């Protein structure tokens, strides 16, 4: 997915969402945020979507 | 080596001429060992996604 070769659709009914505000003048790659989010998913529950 | 084997055969052998009796006794012990009541326990549900 990180490479431009795959697109994934995750079917969620409803979920808690959180969001971060960045500066448009600062280039960045947002992969670490998702990886952190993935790092805390388990069959018991999930953290809020960033 | 339940019977007919105490002081007649070696520790590393088995009597081939008394096989039926020994097998029968072994099964009898197998049977007697399982005479129990399958008691119930605490059933519960799982909140896990599985």
């Amino acid at each position: 997915v990180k490479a431009g070769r795959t697109r994934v659709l995750v079917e969620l009914g409803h979920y808690v969402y959180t969001l971060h505000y960045y500066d448009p003048q600062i280039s960045l790659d947002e992969a670490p945020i998702l990886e952190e989010w993935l790092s805390k998913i388990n069959p018991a529950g999930i953290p809020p979507v960033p | 080596k339940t019977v007919l084997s105490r002081g007649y055969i070696d520790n590393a052998q088995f009597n081939p001429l008394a096989l039926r009796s020994n097998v029968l006794l072994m099964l009898l012990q197998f049977t007697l060992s399982n005479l129990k009541i399958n008691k119930s326990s605490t059933f519960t549900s799982d909140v896990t996604t599985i």
Partner: peptide
């Protein structure tokens, strides 16, 4: 403060049983 109560012990036990590791060391990512 908020109202919250511990879940029944039986449920917690079974739930904690099935918790695979989220991140694992795999020598392959190709």
């Amino acid at each position: 403060d908020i109202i919250t109560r511990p879940t029944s012990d039986s449920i917690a036990a079974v739930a904690n049983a099935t918790k695979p590791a989220a991140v694992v060391s795999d020598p392959q990512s190709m």
